[PDB]
Amino acid sequence: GSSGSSGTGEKPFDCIDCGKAFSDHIGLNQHRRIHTGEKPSGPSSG
């Protein structure tokens, strides 16, 4: 849950996995580490 509409800023590196934002490639990739590794099991993903 994010607040504040105005004042978004520049963040081309936004995690598409969860929807986070980052102002640096390294910062983003380093964060994706939480998603990269474990995948959805079962008949369907979601």
CA distances from 1 to 26, 28, 42, 44, 46 (A): 24, 19, 28, 27, 21
How far from 32 is each of 2, 11, 36, CA to CA, in Å?
19, 15, 6
Cβ distance to Zn ion smaller for residue 15 or 43: 15
Applying the rule CB under 5 A, the residues between 5 and 44 that interact with Zn ion are: 15, 17-18, 20
The CB-of-12 to Zn ion minimum distance in angstroms stands at 15
Q: Using CB under 5 A, count the residues that bind Zn ion.
A: 4
Q: Which residues bind Zn ion (CB under 5 A)?
A: 15, 17-18, 20
